[PDB]
Amino acid sequence: KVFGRCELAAAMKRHGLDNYRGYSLGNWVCAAKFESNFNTQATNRNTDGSTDYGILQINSRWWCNDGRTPGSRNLCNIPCSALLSSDITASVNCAKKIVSDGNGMNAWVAWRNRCKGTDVQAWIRGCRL
Numbered sequence: 610k611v612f613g614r615c616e617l618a619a620a621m622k623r624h625g626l627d628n629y630r631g632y633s634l635g636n637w638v639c640a641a642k643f644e645s646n647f648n649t650q651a652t653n654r655n656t657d658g659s660t661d662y663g664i665l666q667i668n669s670r671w672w673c674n675d676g677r678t679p680g681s682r683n684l685c686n687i688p689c690s691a692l693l694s695s696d697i698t699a700s701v702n703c704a705k706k707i708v709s710d711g712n713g714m715n716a717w718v719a720w721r722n723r724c725k726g727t728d729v730q731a732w733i734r735g736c737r738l
């Protein structure tokens with residue numbers, strides 16, 4: 610599923626991402642935009658053989674099990690395929706784990722490069738939330 614900007618903001622806000630670990634909702638929408646272009650089915654293979662999954666491009670080396678990333682961990686205790694569902698519950702819960710891990714949203718490179726320091730509030734401007 611490809612979310613509408615405001616639609617995703619609302620879903621994220623209902624799943625408790627609004628100001629989670631001090632990151633306002635705009636940050637998470639911005640990150641999703643540049644990680645996946647709001648597409649829940651987005652996948653990307655990394656040069657190290659790991660793969661990134663879903664709206665938030667969560668990596669199989671650490672966070673999910675895809676059964677072909679050797680030596681990896683599965684810190685969220687889920688199959689990576691769960692992260693491609695249209696229901697974003699799995700992704701959100703895993704992201705909360707990730708962001709609490711100590712690097713905050715810097716874990717997400719697109720956030721760091723493209724959202725950090727910007728007017729992220731623009732991303733939720735004119736939404737009914």
Ligand SMILES: [Pt+2]
Pocket residue numbers: 620623624696697698
């Ligand atoms: Pt939901």
Ligand SMILES: [Pt+2]
Pocket residue numbers: 623624625698701
């Ligand atoms: Pt939830």
